[PDB]
Design a protein around this nucleic acid. Structure first.
Lengths: 141, 164, 259
RNA sequence: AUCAGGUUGAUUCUGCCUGACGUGGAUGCUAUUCUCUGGGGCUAAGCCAUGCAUGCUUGUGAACUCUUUGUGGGGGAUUAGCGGACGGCUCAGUGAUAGCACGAUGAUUUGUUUGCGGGAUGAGCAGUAGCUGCGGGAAACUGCAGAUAGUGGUCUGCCCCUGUGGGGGUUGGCAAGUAAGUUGUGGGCCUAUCAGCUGGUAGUUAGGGUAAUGGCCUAACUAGGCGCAGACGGGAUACGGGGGAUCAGGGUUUGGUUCCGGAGAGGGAGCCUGAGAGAUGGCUACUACGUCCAAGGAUGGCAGCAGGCGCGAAACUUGCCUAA
C-alpha cells in the first residue's frame, strides 16, 4: 500500500526506459567488517532507515544481544546482558537492558526468536529507536 | 505557543510525566502556514541567528521541468487533485510538498511534440483538453515557491489510479 | 544559565600561566582568535610577569597603546590577545626577539633568539578545502594559505614566512626525525622517532630522548621540528627537554648507593 | 588492633543499660595579646520605611556664542552605535527529564575576536528628533502648528533561478576560534499493610513545524510497549557533584554553605527587542496582599549591600574606598 512513487533518494532515471536498462541499485559495505546481504541487491523495497540501501549513517558503538520478540512492523526487541560489581560484598550480579531496533526487510526470513544480532548506533529514529541491525548469528543445535 | 520539547510525554513504561521547568524560546514553533492558490503573497520572517525564511501565503506560476528534454518552463497553477496524506487538503486547494496539481499546458507546446502518440497516449489526450499534471518537490512554507516536474509514463500511471 | 560567561575566577586559571592563588579573585580572560583556549596565554601577562617590564596595569596599558609590541611581525594593542606555541614577540626599542615555549615542568617559557631567526614559524597542516576556484590549507594556529604545493597533506610540518605569510618548505614524518610534544602527559619533551605503528585509527610514535630514555605518544600531540639529530629548525631551550627522573636527581645531590 | 560498672546467699553464662574518646548546632559561668579562618541556612521561597547596587562611545553637532568674518571657529541638546542574557543572592520545585563518567551531532545555529573576500556617489517625491511658539493635568504623564540632518517609498541600474516564455531579491560571504542547543548507555534515599501497569500509549507510511533529528504535532492504518534483575504507586528535613566527619582492616555517616552544573525571583500564564532571554533593578493579563489621590485617575515587587518588623533555642555595620 504505497502512497508515493518508489524511487531511491539520489538516483534519477528517465521516463521512457526499458525494464532491463535503467539505473542500478546502490548498496554499501557497512562498518568495516559487515558485508551487505544478498537479498539487498536482488529485491525491491524502499527504506529510508535501511543501513545498506538507505539514508542513515552508522556512527557509534556496536553491541550484541539476543532476539526476544518480533511483533511490530520492522521493529524487534533485543536483550543485552551485563554485570555489576558490589564492593561491600565482593561479588557480582547479573543484569539486562532492553533495546528497540530497526530491522530492514532484507533480513525477512533470516532472524528468528533466539538468534544473536549485532546492532549499530544512529541518530534518533523514533521515540524509542536509535539503532539498527547489521548482522546475525543463528543459534546452534 | 507551539513548542517542540518532549518533557510532557508519558515514559516508555507508561508512567505519568513530571515537569520541572518553564518553556524555553529555544524550542518555540509556529502554526501551519496553508499556501492556497491565487495572487502571490510571500512574507519574510526573522528566524534564529538573524536569518530569514520566506513564508508563502498564496501562489501562482509554478516552475516546472519537462524531464524527457530537460527544460524548465513557468506554468500556471489550476487546481489540486491529490495529496498523499490528507484528502481534506485537496478540498481546500492547499499546496504542500508532494501534492499533485493540474497545470496549464501552453508553455510546453514545443516540448511535447518530440513524443509520439505511441507508448504514452495518455499524455497526449490531456494535452488536447488544455492541461498537464505535475508534482511539487519544494516546501512552499519554508522557501516561498513551488517547483517540481511533469508526470510521464510510470509516474503518470501510478498516480492516475489514485485520483481516478 | 544559557548565556555566555565573561569572567574567570582565579582558582580555575590554567597551571601553565603560573598565577598566585591569592592576589585577587579574578584572572584575565583571553579573547578568541589564533590558537585554542587551552593552549594560549593572554598577551598582557607576558609583558608584566615574564619580562617584568610593567609593574602595574596603568603602565602596561601605556606600553600597548604606544604601539611597542608585535606578535608575529604585526602590531598588537590588546591585552587579551592570545599567544601560542612557537610564536615570535618583537620589541623595537631595546631590540629583542623571543619565542614562546614550554619547560619540562610544563610551564610557559620565553626564549631569546636572534634577528634572522625571528622570521620563522612552524605549524601543522590540519584541514584542506577548495572555495571559489582556489585551493587552501589550514594551519594549526588557524590561518589559510592559498597556492601551496599540491603535495602537502594532513600531518606535515610547514614553515611560514612570518613577514609575507607564505610557505617555504615542509617536513614529512618518518623514522629518524625529531619531535616536540605540545601537550599531554609528556608535554615539553624532545625525542627521535624509532617506530611508527597503528591501532584503531591511531598512530603512535616510539621515541628516544637525547639521553637514552624511551618514550611514546600519539601523533596528535607532536610537531616535527627537525630532519635529523643535528638538523633541527629552531633553537631549543637551555636544558633541551630531558626530564631526568627522581632516582637520577638525588644521586646528583647524594651520590650512588652501591651494595 | 585496649575496655570497665550493674540480675546471685555465692558461681559460670546469655542479654541489654550506663561510663570512658571524637565532631556539628544551641546554652551557663569566666576571660590579657597577636596571627590566620568563619557568622538570619534549619522556623517564615514570611512582609518590607529610607539610601545606594547600570551606564558609556562618536566620521552626530541644535540653542547660544566669538571673531572683522569665512565651503571660519567654540559649545554641547538629540540622532546613530555598544551594553544592560554576565556579575551578585537563594534552595521552593525536581529521586532522574537534573548531575557525574565515557560517547554521537555525517541532524544544528553562533555578535564582539583572527585571516581572506565583498561595497550604487543615479533619478523623482514624501517626510522626523533636538530646536522656535501655543497648551492641557492634583498627579503620573502628554497634545497641536512651524521649519531642518540622518531617513523611508517608487523608477533606473545591479545581482539570483530560467529561457525558442518569464519570475524573484536589494547585498546578507568563506574558514578557524569562542559559545549554545539536541541526543545513547550505566550507578544502594526508605517502602509489597504498593502486583500488575499504559490511549499519543508502542510502531509503520505521508505531510507540517523547527536553526536542527524525533509522536514534537496532525491524517490514515497496524496492536503493540514495560514488569519480583521490583514495573506502576505512596512516604521522609531530597537541589546533584568536587568534597566533610569517624578510624587496624573491611565499613558507617553526612554535604542549605567557597569551585563547577542546574533551577527560581509573591503565585500562574503569555510575549516584544536582540547574535543570545520565554528576562522580572523588561512589558501585558488573571490572582494574594496592598499604596497615593483634588475622587477621575495613577501606581508596587530586598531569595543585591546595609537596615526594620515578625518568627523562634538560634546568627554583625543604615560605616570608608577616583588605591589592589
Amino acid at each position: 500500500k504505497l502512497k508515493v512513487f518508489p524511487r531511491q533518494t539520489g538516483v534519477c532515471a528517465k521516463p521512457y526506459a526499458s525494464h532491463e536498462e535503467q539505473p542500478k541499485r546502490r548498496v554499501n559495505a557497512e562498518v568495516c567488517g559487515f558485508k551487505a546481504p544478498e537479498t539487498a541487491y536482488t529485491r525491491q523495497y524502499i527504506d529510508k532507515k535501511c543501513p545498506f540501501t538507505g539514508d542513515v549513517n552508522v556512527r557509534g558503538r556496536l553491541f550484541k544481544g539476543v532476539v526476544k520478540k518480533m511483533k511490530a512492523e520492522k521493529t524487534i526487541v533485543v536483550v543485552a546482558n551485563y554485570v555489576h560489581y558490589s564492593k561491600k560484598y565482593k561479588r557480582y550480579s547479573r543484569r539486562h537492558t532492553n533495546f528497540s531496533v530497526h530491522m530492514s526487510p532484507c533480513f525477512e526470513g533470516m532472524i528468528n526468536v533466539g538468534d544473536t544480532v549485532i546492532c549499530g548506533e544512529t541518530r534518533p529514529l523514533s521515540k524509542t529507536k536509535s539503532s539498527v541491525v547489521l548482522g546475525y548469528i543463528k543459534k546452534a543445535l | 505557543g507551539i513548542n517542540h520539547r518532549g518533557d510532557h510525554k508519558r515514559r516508555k513504561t507508561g508512567a505519568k510525566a513530571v515537569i520541572s521547568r518553564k518553556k524555553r524560546n529555544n524550542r518555540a514553533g509556529s502554526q501551519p502556514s496553508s499556501t492556497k492558490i491565487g495572487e502571490r503573497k510571500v512574507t519574510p520572517v526573522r528566524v534564529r541567528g538573524g536569518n530569514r525564511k520566506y513564508k508563502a501565503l498564496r501562489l501562482d506560476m509554478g516552475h516546472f521541468k519537462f524531464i524527457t528534454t530537460g527544460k524548465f518552463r513557468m506554468a500556471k497553477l489550476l487546481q489540486v487533485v491529490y495529496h498523499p496524506s490528507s484528502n481534506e487538503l485537496v478540498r481546500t486547494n492547499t499546496l504542500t510538498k508532494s501534492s499533485v496539481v493540474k497545470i496549464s499546458a501552453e508553455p510546453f507546446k514545443n516540448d511535447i511534440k518530440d513524443v509520439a502518440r505511441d507508448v504514452d497516449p495518455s499524455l497526449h489526450e490531456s494535452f488536447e483538453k488544455g492541461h498537464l499534471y505535475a508534482i511539487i518537490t519544494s516546501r512552499p512554507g519554508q522557501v516561498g515557491m513551488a517547483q517540481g516536474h511533469v508526470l510521464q509514463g510510470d509516474e503518470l500511471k501510478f498516480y492516475a489510479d489514485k485520483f481516478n | 544559565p544559557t548565556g555566555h560567561r565573561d569572567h574567570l575566577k582565579r582558582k580555575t586559571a590554567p597551571k601553565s600561566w603560573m598565577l598566585d592563588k591569592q592576589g585577587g579573585t579574578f584572572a584575565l580572560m583571553p579573547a578568541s582568535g589564533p590558537h585554542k583556549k587551552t593552549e594560549c596565554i593572554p598577551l598582557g601577562y607576558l609583558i608584566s610577569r615574564f619580562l617584568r617590564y610593567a609593574s602595574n596595569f596603568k603602565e602596561l596599558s601605556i606600553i600597548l597603546a604606544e604601539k611597542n609590541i608585535k606578535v608575529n611581525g604585526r602590531v598588537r594593542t590588546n591585552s587579551h590577545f592570545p599567544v601560542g606555541l612557537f610564536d615570535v614577540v618583537s620589541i623595537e626599542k631595546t631590540g629583542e626577539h623571543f619565542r614562546v615555549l614550554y619547560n619540562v615542568h610544563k610551564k610557559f617559557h620565553l626564549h631569546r633568539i636572534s634577528s634572522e631567526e625571528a622570521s620563522y614559524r612552524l605549524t601543522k597542516v590540519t584541514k584542506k578545502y577548495e572555495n571559489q576556484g582556489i585551493p587552501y590549507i589550514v594551519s594549526s594556529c588557524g590561518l589559510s594559505i592559498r597556492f601551496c604545493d599540491p603535495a602537502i597533506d594532513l600531518g606535515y610540518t610547514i614553515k611560514i614566512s612570518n613577514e609575507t605569510s607564505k610557505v617555504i618548505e615542509y617536513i614529512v614524518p618518518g623514522p629518524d626525525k625529531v619531535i616536540f610534544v605540545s601537550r599531554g602527559k609528556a608535554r615539553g619533551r624532545v625525542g627521535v622517532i624509532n617506530t611508527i605503528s597503528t591501532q584503531g585509527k591511531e598512530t603512535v610514535y616510539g621515541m628516544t630522548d637525547f639521553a637514552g630514555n624511551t618514550f611514546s605518544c600519539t601523533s596528535k600531540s607532536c610537531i616535527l621540528i627537525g630532519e635529523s639529530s643535528e638538523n633541527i629548525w629552531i633553537t631549543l631551550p637551555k636544558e633541551r627537554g630531558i626530564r631526568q627522573s627522581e632516582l637520577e636527581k638525588i644521586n646528583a645531590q647524594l651520590g650512588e648507593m652501591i651494595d
